[PDB]
Amino acid sequence: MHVKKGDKVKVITGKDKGKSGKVLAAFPKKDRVLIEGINMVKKHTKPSNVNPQGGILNVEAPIHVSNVMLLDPKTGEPTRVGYEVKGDKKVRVAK
Amino acid sequence: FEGGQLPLFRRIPKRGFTNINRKEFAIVNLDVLNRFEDGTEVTPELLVETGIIRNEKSGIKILSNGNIEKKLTVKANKFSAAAKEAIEAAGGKTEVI
RNA sequence: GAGCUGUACGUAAGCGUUGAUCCAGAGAUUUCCGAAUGGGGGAACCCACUAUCUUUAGUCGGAUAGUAUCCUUACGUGAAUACAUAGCGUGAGGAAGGCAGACCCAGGGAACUGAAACAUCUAAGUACCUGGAGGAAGAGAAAGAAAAAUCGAUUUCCUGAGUAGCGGCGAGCGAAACGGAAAGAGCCCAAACCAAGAAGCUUGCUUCUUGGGGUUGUAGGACACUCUAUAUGGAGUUACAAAAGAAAGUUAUAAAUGAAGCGGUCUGGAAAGGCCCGCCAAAGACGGUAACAGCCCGGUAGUUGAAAUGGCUUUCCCUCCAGAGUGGAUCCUGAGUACGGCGGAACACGUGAAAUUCCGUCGGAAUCCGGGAGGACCAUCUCCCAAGGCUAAAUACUCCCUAGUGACCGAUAGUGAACCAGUACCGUGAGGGAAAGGUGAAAAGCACCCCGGAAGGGGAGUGAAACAGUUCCUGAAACCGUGUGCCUACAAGUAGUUAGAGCCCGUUAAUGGGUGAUAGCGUGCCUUUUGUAGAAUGAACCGGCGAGUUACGAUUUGUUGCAAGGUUAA
RNA sequence: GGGUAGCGGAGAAAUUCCAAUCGAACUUGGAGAUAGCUGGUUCUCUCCGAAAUAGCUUUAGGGCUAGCCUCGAGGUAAAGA
RNA sequence: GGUUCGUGGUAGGAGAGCGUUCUAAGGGCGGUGAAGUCAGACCGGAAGGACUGGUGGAGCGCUUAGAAGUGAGAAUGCCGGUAUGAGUAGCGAAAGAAGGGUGAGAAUCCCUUCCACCGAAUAUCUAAGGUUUCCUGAGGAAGGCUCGUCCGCUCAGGGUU
RNA sequence: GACUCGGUGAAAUUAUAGUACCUGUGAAGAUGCAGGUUACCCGCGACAGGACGGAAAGACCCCGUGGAGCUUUACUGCAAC
Ligand SMILES: [Mg+2]
Ligand SMILES: [Mg+2]
Ligand SMILES: [Mg+2]
Ligand SMILES: [Mg+2]
Ligand SMILES: [Mg+2]
Ligand SMILES: [Mg+2]
Ligand SMILES: [Mg+2]
Ligand SMILES: [Mg+2]
Ligand SMILES: [Mg+2]
Ligand SMILES: [Mg+2]
Ligand SMILES: [Mg+2]
Ligand SMILES: [Mg+2]
Ligand SMILES: [Mg+2]
Ligand SMILES: [Mg+2]
Ligand SMILES: [Mg+2]
Ligand SMILES: [Mg+2]
Ligand SMILES: [Mg+2]
Ligand SMILES: [Mg+2]
Ligand SMILES: [Mg+2]
Ligand SMILES: [Mg+2]
Ligand SMILES: [Mg+2]
Ligand SMILES: [Mg+2]
Ligand SMILES: [Mg+2]
Ligand SMILES: [Mg+2]
Ligand SMILES: [Mg+2]
Ligand SMILES: [Mg+2]
Ligand SMILES: [Mg+2]
Ligand SMILES: [Mg+2]
Ligand SMILES: [Mg+2]
Ligand SMILES: [Mg+2]
Ligand SMILES: [Mg+2]
Ligand SMILES: [Mg+2]
Ligand SMILES: [Mg+2]
Ligand SMILES: [Mg+2]
Ligand SMILES: [Mg+2]
Ligand SMILES: [Mg+2]
Ligand SMILES: [Mg+2]
Ligand SMILES: [Mg+2]
Ligand SMILES: [Mg+2]
Ligand SMILES: [Mg+2]
Ligand SMILES: [Mg+2]
Ligand SMILES: [Mg+2]
Ligand SMILES: [Mg+2]
Ligand SMILES: [Mg+2]
Ligand SMILES: [Mg+2]
Ligand SMILES: [Mg+2]
Ligand SMILES: [Mg+2]
Ligand SMILES: [Mg+2]
Ligand SMILES: [Mg+2]
Ligand SMILES: [Mg+2]
Ligand SMILES: [Mg+2]
Ligand SMILES: [Mg+2]
């Protein structure tokens, strides 16, 4: 996937477009990603689970990968990603 | 089928035979020989090139039907007595190749 | 190149940039059953023997290997019986079984049906059974087709032609050659004869093995002479002899790179949509993404890529190899064969005037001065040379693989099977054989409160929506209910229709809607019938599904093109 | 526990039994057998509109030709009523 | 465009059309709500077609041509659903009773006592056959012809020397 | 057992039904047609005269150029001898 955990992404579609965050997790089998402070959902949690007072928990839900663009630290703008080889391993490049 | 009444074809007799050596000639009536230019030598090969007879079954026979104007030299495998007379009456020669 | 420990709605314990999971090539491991093969057996089990090792004080245990049958073939043993054969043993090779419910060749081979009955005939050499296979098979280099005077192996297609014929001359069956195409390719023996053995002893003659030689028609060969080759050249594993290798290239089996909009604004839960601006394009394929995206993602065009294995093509290696001429003393040129009688079959051809080909049976040639065929048969002429073998391609089919396509289906359709289906279930068994798809973009899958044992509800919350609440898109009809505007307890009803007060409404605004006291008229629908309200038939109701089609011919009408011409097939 | 199997078995014999089947089991296939018979055959309007007869028929509730219907075209001492 | 004569109809002939799915081309609609579905007093000579509103939540018309799995009320049709008969027949041979307990709930589960039935069996073994039905703990949706706290039922663990 | 109550709860059948009688009529035997004669609405227990009641595409009878089994000095065959 064009992003991975640790990446700073901008969200380009949905109720959260214009917002940026860090990629907390990637689900490449579902092609979805978990962005910090994006797509917050209210989980009605019973006490039973790890959470000995239960309650209505407000947490991040995964976004589709095609809905985030990578942030280039130099420009600080959403950029499409190229792949260029330094010598040993290849690395992502902005355009 | 006639619902059991003996069908027509069985009420009446078979007739004749087919000849293994039956010759059928390509027929050319005089009228189409007018197509050709005067004093010209009309062969079978010339009669198939022009496109007057395509398949020359057993040979080319000339028949009278119509009337010839031009003075030709017609060579064919057969002529009707009338055809010969007519080709000559115009002022031509028939040869039997 | 960053996550991973499969589904699927888990808990746990862990792994991973010192590159996991994942993808491709190649290895290793691979219980038991099954041809099943050490013996047995009711498959997936039981019970051994012989070596070698191991364990124990020894039984008792453990490990590894071998041990079926038949055929062929070496070798050894070896009876009645003297030699010997059979038999027996050992060692090598090989086979066995399965299947693509297809295609192919062979052995065996129906009936229904058609003939308006039925027996010949048809169906049909089909179905089916059995055997043999191969990637194809079969066929095949003329004892051929012909008779335009010539062609030149076979196969397949077009045509000939529904012709010639066959036929209770019925129903029906039905060629072939010529012509046009696809594809093309030719070869090896047997025999004369030569050499070398081997034997029989016919005792120097004969037949047996191996090698050479040799392959055909107005003849060829052997055999005589003669010229050149004895690897100069040529040819090969697809026939033409048969095994081997390399190397290079290329294809397949993983991948890599890959242009251009987070453009503005509108609606919206969300924009890929609208409106307004840009841009890329050898890329406007397809899919995904919160509605419809060339420019968001996976990609796409283009351009790169392979350690390993397999295929293919070349080249090299390796291997193998005589071919013209001249005579015609003699010799050779497929025998229980060809052919014939009898009985069958195959030939389009049903015994016919019945050629041609095959089978059983009996009889049985010639053998270069020879033989066969040209649809009885004879003569002439012409064309061929059987009784031995091999041979690619053009053709058939698809269980499969890869890439695609469709005026094909879209959940009663399409496969029987979109879903754990040949399942469940039925049957002793062979065998028969279902039903059953859709929450949402995302689980955000309803904390909490309340009634209730729970189920189930009502709130609250999530969500665009919950009248989307775990079978959850839509949600028709039958059918079941609640409510109520008009009518109904003196009436005799195929249930409506026409007239019509009264009461109740208010429309796609119309000489409107609902109901209907009372009055007139009025025997469902369908099928089948001379005739049915019918006491004839069919339908409980609703829904879905459910019947003149296609191919190839014939004929006729219409249309169009061309017209004494028109038109091409493969 | 075994044997006999459908063109067949078995029968102190009834056409009796062979897996709730027997004047010839069951199953799959030939196979969509055949059915001159019965049933069924789905939208609309417009124009016309029969027959239930003759002959022959292993024919009689089938068929064929003719008669009667329909559509198109032709032709004239118009021949029809 | 008039005139004249016509316009009942089964088998059946002839004609013109409606509507359905798909294709092509053109031109459109549609999250400001597509198809479908529901309702209505609208339009056309018929088959049929619109409009408006509800539901629905993403696709669909129109024009001209083309192609068909192209139209159902009947087949004792096939499949599914749902009626009617009807709260009807039936509830499958038999003796129960009360007290106590359990439980949200008890004719139906447990315990006690009395009563009753089999006793060449309705008792005890055991072969076949079945295959976990056995035991214990939970359960009460479905199954059990009623009920159910119970069970040869459901879920877990166990159990055969 | 029936009947009443509590629990549970089928089926055959069924074009739609507001489903009288008489005499007639009619495909010749009518709940449904005509003319009359009777009859307030809804049930429950009973009985079977009718619905040519249900069940089963009549087994009788005939028909089909349908089957099948059986017979023989029917025809043509085949085994066996
Ligand atoms: Mg690695
Ligand atoms: Mg064994
Ligand atoms: Mg017949
Ligand atoms: Mg890109
Ligand atoms: Mg907005
Ligand atoms: Mg949507
Ligand atoms: Mg979409
Ligand atoms: Mg013979
Ligand atoms: Mg024959
Ligand atoms: Mg001869
Ligand atoms: Mg013979
Ligand atoms: Mg001969
Ligand atoms: Mg001859
Ligand atoms: Mg002949
Ligand atoms: Mg010869
Ligand atoms: Mg299906
Ligand atoms: Mg559906
Ligand atoms: Mg099915
Ligand atoms: Mg549901
Ligand atoms: Mg009153
Ligand atoms: Mg009164
Ligand atoms: Mg009925
Ligand atoms: Mg035609
Ligand atoms: Mg029986
Ligand atoms: Mg057949
Ligand atoms: Mg049938
Ligand atoms: Mg009329
Ligand atoms: Mg007769
Ligand atoms: Mg009739
Ligand atoms: Mg009139
Ligand atoms: Mg009319
Ligand atoms: Mg017609
Ligand atoms: Mg549609
Ligand atoms: Mg609907
Ligand atoms: Mg249809
Ligand atoms: Mg129906
Ligand atoms: Mg009753
Ligand atoms: Mg009763
Ligand atoms: Mg009772
Ligand atoms: Mg009981
Ligand atoms: Mg006793
Ligand atoms: Mg127990
Ligand atoms: Mg119960
Ligand atoms: Mg219990
Ligand atoms: Mg009761
Ligand atoms: Mg009368
Ligand atoms: Mg009467
Ligand atoms: Mg009356
Ligand atoms: Mg009646
Ligand atoms: Mg009856
Ligand atoms: Mg009958
Ligand atoms: Mg009968």
Coordinates of C-alpha atoms (C1' of nucleotides) in Angstrom, one line a residue, chain C residues 116-119 489-496 522-524 528-529 531-536 539-541, chain F residues 14-20 26-33 38-41 50-52 65-66 75-76:
Chain C
rA116 C1' -49.5 -45.2 -41.2
rA117 C1' -50.3 -53.4 -39.7
rC118 C1' -45.8 -56.5 -40.5
rA119 C1' -42.0 -60.5 -41.7
rA489 C1' -82.3 -8.9 11.8
rC490 C1' -90.1 -10.0 6.7
rA491 C1' -85.6 -11.7 3.6
rA492 C1' -85.5 -16.4 -1.6
rG493 C1' -79.8 -13.5 -3.5
rU494 C1' -74.2 -16.6 -10.3
rA495 C1' -74.1 -11.5 -6.2
rG496 C1' -73.7 -7.7 -10.9
rG522 C1' -79.8 -11.2 -15.2
rU523 C1' -78.4 -19.6 -15.0
rG524 C1' -69.8 -18.3 -13.4
rU528 C1' -65.7 -30.5 -25.2
rU529 C1' -70.0 -30.8 -28.0
rG531 C1' -76.7 -29.2 -28.0
rU532 C1' -73.6 -27.6 -21.5
rA533 C1' -76.1 -22.8 -16.0
rG534 C1' -75.1 -27.6 -16.5
rA535 C1' -76.7 -33.0 -12.4
rA536 C1' -70.3 -33.5 -18.3
rA539 C1' -59.2 -25.0 -11.5
rA540 C1' -59.0 -24.2 -3.1
rC541 C1' -56.6 -19.3 -3.5
Chain F
rU14 C1' -63.1 -26.4 -2.0
rA15 C1' -65.2 -21.8 -9.3
rU16 C1' -67.2 -17.5 -6.5
rA17 C1' -71.7 -18.1 -3.1
rG18 C1' -76.5 -13.7 0.7
rU19 C1' -76.9 -21.8 -0.8
rA20 C1' -85.8 -23.0 0.9
rG26 C1' -84.0 -27.2 -19.8
rA27 C1' -78.2 -31.7 -22.3
rA28 C1' -84.9 -35.0 -21.5
rG29 C1' -83.7 -36.1 -12.9
rA30 C1' -82.5 -27.8 -10.7
rU31 C1' -80.4 -24.5 -4.0
rG32 C1' -79.2 -21.1 -8.4
rC33 C1' -84.2 -20.9 -14.8
rU38 C1' -93.1 -20.6 2.3
rA39 C1' -89.2 -18.1 5.1
rC40 C1' -86.8 -12.6 11.1
rC41 C1' -80.7 -12.7 12.2
rG50 C1' -80.1 -34.1 -2.1
rA51 C1' -75.8 -31.4 -3.5
rC52 C1' -76.2 -37.1 -9.9
rU65 C1' -54.2 -50.9 -38.0
rG66 C1' -52.2 -49.7 -28.3
rC75 C1' -47.4 -67.2 -40.9
rU76 C1' -42.2 -66.8 -40.8

